[PDB]
Design a protein around this motif. Structure first.
Motif, PDB file in Angstrom:
ATOM      1  N   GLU A   8      44.481 101.962  21.527  1.00 36.16           N
ATOM      2  CA  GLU A   8      46.134 101.467  21.024  1.00 36.16           C
ATOM      3  C   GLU A   8      46.442 101.623  19.229  1.00 36.16           C
ATOM      4  OE1 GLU A   8      47.328  98.088  23.274  1.00 36.16           O
ATOM      5  OE2 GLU A   8      46.024  98.682  24.900  1.00 36.16           O
ATOM      6  N   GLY A   9      46.616 102.712  19.036  1.00 36.79           N
ATOM      7  CA  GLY A   9      46.825 102.653  17.285  1.00 36.79           C
ATOM      8  C   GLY A   9      45.650 102.857  16.996  1.00 36.79           C
ATOM      9  N   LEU A  10      45.461 102.221  15.534  1.00 34.59           N
ATOM     10  CA  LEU A  10      44.097 102.149  14.804  1.00 34.59           C
ATOM     11  C   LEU A  10      43.327 101.164  15.397  1.00 34.59           C
ATOM     12  CD1 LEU A  10      45.103 102.014  11.531  1.00 34.59           C
ATOM     13  CD2 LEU A  10      44.722 103.496  12.167  1.00 34.59           C
ATOM     14  N   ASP A  11      43.271 100.564  17.155  1.00 34.70           N
ATOM     15  CA  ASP A  11      42.483  99.715  17.657  1.00 34.70           C
ATOM     16  C   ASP A  11      42.526 100.108  19.035  1.00 34.70           C
ATOM     17  OD1 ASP A  11      45.782  97.869  15.595  1.00 34.70           O
ATOM     18  OD2 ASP A  11      42.964  96.560  15.729  1.00 34.70           O
ATOM     19  N   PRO A  12      41.055  99.417  19.243  1.00 36.09           N
ATOM     20  CA  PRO A  12      40.624 100.642  20.849  1.00 36.09           C
ATOM     21  C   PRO A  12      42.025 100.150  22.108  1.00 36.09           C
ATOM     22  CG  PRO A  12      39.535  98.510  20.187  1.00 36.09           C
ATOM     23  CD  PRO A  12      39.938  98.947  18.956  1.00 36.09           C
ATOM     24  N   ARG A 245      33.394  99.422  10.788  1.00 34.06           N
ATOM     25  CA  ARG A 245      33.928  98.641  11.829  1.00 34.06           C
ATOM     26  C   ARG A 245      34.885  98.289  12.719  1.00 34.06           C
ATOM     27  NH1 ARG A 245      35.199  94.121  14.006  1.00 34.06           N
ATOM     28  NH2 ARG A 245      37.419  93.675  11.868  1.00 34.06           N
ATOM     29  N   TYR A 246      36.338  98.530  11.426  1.00 34.21           N
ATOM     30  CA  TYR A 246      37.111  97.950  12.377  1.00 34.21           C
ATOM     31  C   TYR A 246      38.082  99.457  12.904  1.00 34.21           C
ATOM     32  CZ  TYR A 246      42.611  97.135  12.570  1.00 34.21           C
ATOM     33  OH  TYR A 246      44.089  97.114  13.225  1.00 34.21           O
ATOM     34  N   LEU A 247      37.126 100.302  12.784  1.00 31.95           N
ATOM     35  CA  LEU A 247      38.515 101.343  13.313  1.00 31.95           C
ATOM     36  C   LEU A 247      36.942 102.619  14.111  1.00 31.95           C
ATOM     37  CD1 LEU A 247      39.532 103.111   9.787  1.00 31.95           C
ATOM     38  CD2 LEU A 247      41.097 102.113  12.024  1.00 31.95           C
ATOM     39  N   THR A 248      36.019 102.352  13.915  1.00 28.94           N
ATOM     40  CA  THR A 248      34.911 102.768  15.020  1.00 28.94           C
ATOM     41  C   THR A 248      35.146 104.358  15.261  1.00 28.94           C
ATOM     42  OG1 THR A 248      34.303 101.144  15.894  1.00 28.94           O
ATOM     43  CG2 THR A 248      32.877 102.614  16.934  1.00 28.94           C
ATOM     44  N   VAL A 289      31.255  89.288  14.414  1.00 27.01           N
ATOM     45  CA  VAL A 289      32.141  88.651  13.468  1.00 27.01           C
ATOM     46  C   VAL A 289      33.164  87.872  13.401  1.00 27.01           C
ATOM     47  CG1 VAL A 289      31.348  90.420  12.177  1.00 27.01           C
ATOM     48  CG2 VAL A 289      33.364  90.908  13.928  1.00 27.01           C
ATOM     49  N   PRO A 290      34.138  86.942  13.563  1.00 27.44           N
ATOM     50  CA  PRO A 290      34.720  85.804  13.642  1.00 27.44           C
ATOM     51  C   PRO A 290      36.619  86.784  12.934  1.00 27.44           C
ATOM     52  CG  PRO A 290      34.851  85.439  11.778  1.00 27.44           C
ATOM     53  CD  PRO A 290      33.609  86.246  11.388  1.00 27.44           C
ATOM     54  N   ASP A 291      36.797  86.409  14.243  1.00 25.01           N
ATOM     55  CA  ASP A 291      38.795  86.988  13.815  1.00 25.01           C
ATOM     56  C   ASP A 291      38.418  88.932  13.858  1.00 25.01           C
ATOM     57  OD1 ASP A 291      40.167  84.230  14.173  1.00 25.01           O
ATOM     58  OD2 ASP A 291      40.033  84.005  11.671  1.00 25.01           O
ATOM     59  N   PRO A 292      37.337  89.041  15.158  1.00 21.70           N
ATOM     60  CA  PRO A 292      37.785  90.641  15.114  1.00 21.70           C
ATOM     61  C   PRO A 292      38.674  91.532  15.283  1.00 21.70           C
ATOM     62  CG  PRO A 292      37.414  89.716  17.371  1.00 21.70           C
ATOM     63  CD  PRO A 292      37.463  88.330  16.192  1.00 21.70           C
ATOM     64  N   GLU A 293      39.386  91.267  15.703  1.00 25.32           N
ATOM     65  CA  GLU A 293      41.070  92.100  15.544  1.00 25.32           C
ATOM     66  C   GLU A 293      41.414  92.079  13.730  1.00 25.32           C
ATOM     67  OE1 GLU A 293      40.674  88.991  16.365  1.00 25.32           O
ATOM     68  OE2 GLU A 293      42.764  87.613  15.368  1.00 25.32           O
ATOM     69  N   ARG A 294      41.234  91.741  13.214  1.00 27.15           N
ATOM     70  CA  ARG A 294      41.690  91.648  11.927  1.00 27.15           C
ATOM     71  C   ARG A 294      41.057  92.332  10.407  1.00 27.15           C
ATOM     72  NH1 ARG A 294      44.403  87.674  10.619  1.00 27.15           N
ATOM     73  NH2 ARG A 294      42.126  86.059  10.863  1.00 27.15           N
ATOM     74  N   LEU A 295      41.665  93.052   9.896  1.00 24.55           N
ATOM     75  CA  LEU A 295      41.006  94.388   9.403  1.00 24.55           C
ATOM     76  C   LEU A 295      40.933  93.386   7.351  1.00 24.55           C
ATOM     77  CD1 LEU A 295      40.411  97.130   7.811  1.00 24.55           C
ATOM     78  CD2 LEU A 295      42.778  96.765   7.178  1.00 24.55           C
TER      79      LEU A 295
END
Ligand code: HEM
Length: 365
Positions: A8-12, A245-248, A289-295
């Motif tokens: 979903e965009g830059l996110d899975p 990590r964020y973009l995997t 990691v805490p708040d894993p949805e954040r870049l």
């Protein structure tokens, strides 16, 4: 699209992030395929080469110990930290050339077609030991065997690389093909050194390229993150790892087939049942990691599974981090005013590659 491939965009896909750590899909009363969605499960499955297999010359991913061990042993010496730091000058120059091409195109510019889809093969060719003169040809021959027909003549790639190998055999010099020959000579089969060349180019291309474009898009949609690349290299290292990590970019690694009945928590993966490991979901794990949805590039580096885990850990993880740090750092030095030519584009994405990316991206120099 399947859930593990859905992004979903830059996110899975959110459904992945809500699924159980080990989700069981059964088509019968009995083909059972499992999906690992947490950092802990993904690590137990990839880390257990005594109970899980990757078998369906070269392509270490399809090999199991002890055969994988021997192959990887010969090529792993050529990927140390210093060996990669020595490639940094070449990497910088390879990128500076395409950054010079950026000025030549003016403001509206497909960073993808110009830089993202060029830097990878160049740096990789250098690592193997391919002369700068005869390089595009090698890359083009590679993109040819991809059969974008049955007339694809990768025998040309085969004999060009057989010539390079036999030349470095009689003349060991800088490069992975030469380093392997220096310590193993005849023992290293021509087919082996060839399959390794194929492997390195197919693994360090769509991944890096995917990260080159998707990284810029994110860093540009979140401008508070560009600062990390305008200061210490340490501040920049933390940022490449955060972006990975964020973009995997890799959706999943090679499927792992259980060689016996493995108990994973309250569940049991039965012999023959396969496990798909959703790296993007695992790297979005609150336990990692805490708040894993954040870049947040300020984040301290963590043990993400974007480069894998275990015997098949990415042989070029150090190169990918160096081959991405320098680019971002230079991109925001040559063009410190870059923005989105179309701030209202649909960000055309790469949905056919086994690695996520942008098929097109227009910047504004
Ligand atoms: C120049 C860049 C790269 C090179 C040369 C490279 C090379 C390799 C090689 C040779 C392997 C196989 C290791 C083995 O089976 O023994 C591997 C595995 C892997 N690489 Fe890369 N890689 C590169 C970049 C990347 C990037 C950028 C990512 C992710 C963002 C990545 C993710 C992985 C993963 C997840 C695996 C493990 C796959 C599995 O376990 O089945 N690689 N890489």
């Amino acid at each position: 699209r399947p859930v593990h491939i859905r992004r979903e965009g830059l996110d899975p896909a959110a459904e992945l992030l809500a699924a159980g750590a080990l989700t069981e899909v059964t088509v019968g009363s009995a083909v059972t395929t499992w999906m690992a969605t947490t950092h802990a499960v993904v690590r137990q499955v990839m880390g257990d080469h005594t109970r899980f297999s990757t078998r369906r010359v070269g392509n270490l991913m399809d090999y199991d110990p002890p055969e994988h061990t021997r192959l990887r042993q010969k090529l792993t010496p050529g990927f140390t930290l210093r060996k990669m730091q020595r490639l940094q000058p070449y990497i910088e120059q390879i990128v500076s050339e395409r950054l010079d091409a950026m000025e030549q195109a003016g403001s509206p510019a497909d960073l993808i077609e110009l830089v993202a889809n060029e830097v990878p093969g160049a740096v990789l060719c250098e690592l193997i030991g391919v002369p700068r003169d005869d390089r595009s040809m090698f890359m083009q021959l590679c993109h040819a065997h991809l059969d974008p027909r049955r007339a694809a003549a990768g025998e040309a790639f085969s004999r060009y690389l057989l010539a390079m190998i036999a030349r470095e055999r009689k003349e060991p010099g800088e490069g992975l093909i030469g380093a392997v020959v220096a310590e193993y000579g005849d023992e290293a089969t021509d087919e082996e050194l060839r399959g390794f060349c194929v492997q390195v180019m197919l693994a360090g291309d769509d991944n890096i390229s995917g990260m080159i474009g998707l990284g810029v898009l994110a860093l540009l949609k979140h401008p508070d993150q560009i600062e990390a690349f305008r200061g210490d290299e340490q501040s920049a290292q933390r940022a490449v790892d955060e972006l990975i990590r964020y973009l995997t970019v890799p959706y999943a690694p090679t499927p792992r087939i259980a060689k016996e009945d493995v108990t994973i928590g309250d569940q049991v993966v039965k012999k023959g049942e396969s496990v798909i490991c959703s790296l993007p979901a695992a790297n979005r794990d609150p336990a990692l990691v805490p708040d894993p949805e954040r870049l947040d590039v300020t984040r301290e580096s963590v043990s993400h599974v974007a480069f894998g885990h275990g015997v098949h850990h990415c042989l070029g993880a150090a190169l990918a981090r160096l081959e991405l740090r320098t680019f971002y750092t230079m991109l925001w030095r040559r063009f410190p005013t870059l923005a989105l030519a179309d701030p209202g584009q649909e960000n055309n994405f790469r949905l056919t590659t086994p690695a996520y990316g942008l098929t097109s991206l227009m910047v504004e120099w």
